[PDB]
Amino acid sequence: HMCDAFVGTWKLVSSENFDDYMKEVGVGFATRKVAGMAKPNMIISVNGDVITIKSESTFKNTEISFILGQEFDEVTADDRKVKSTITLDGGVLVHVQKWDGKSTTIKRKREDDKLVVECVMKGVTSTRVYERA
Numbered sequence: 001h002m003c004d005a006f007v008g009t010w011k012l013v014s015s016e017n018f019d020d021y022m023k024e025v026g027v028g029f030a031t032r033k034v035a036g037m038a039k040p041n042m043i044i045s046v047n048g049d050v051i052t053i054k055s056e057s058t059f060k061n062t063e064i065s066f067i068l069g070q071e072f073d074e075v076t077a078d079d080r081k082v083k084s085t086i087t088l089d090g091g092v093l094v095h096v097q098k099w100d101g102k103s104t105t106i107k108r109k110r111e112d113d114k115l116v117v118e119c120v121m122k123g124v125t126s127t128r129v130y131e132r133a
């Protein structure tokens, strides 16, 4: 029951500062423009200890499956090959991605009826708000 309140199908309803976050990460112009238009569906499910997070959009469909605390390989939507570890910290899913000596953290939290995603690269934060689909 670890992630019960995350499970479901969620739709993006607002984004702030995502272009600047992508620039800080190193995403190129064309990818930033097309990715920034997307209104993804995020689908979260749990089966035993395995959590799956799928993102479906016009830009790209992504899927990760993982066990908390156990590092895995991830190919991001912008085509980075990263090493990821996801943990639960006081009810917040904390996702760290490491590649080329760099790091970024994505936090996913339940707040009221929303799922709030905060993406941080050094000093730059982006907030992406989802509602139930």
Ligand SMILES: O=C1C=C(O)C[C@H](c2ccc(C(F)(F)F)cc2)C1
Pocket (backbone or CB within 6 Å): 012, 022, 025, 027, 035, 042, 055, 076, 077, 078, 106, 117, 119, 128
């Ligand atoms: O779970 C998530 C929910 C979001 O709203 C966005 C996050 C994300 C960050 C970065 C990228 C990029 F392509 F920029 F790396 C793609 C997606 C992933």
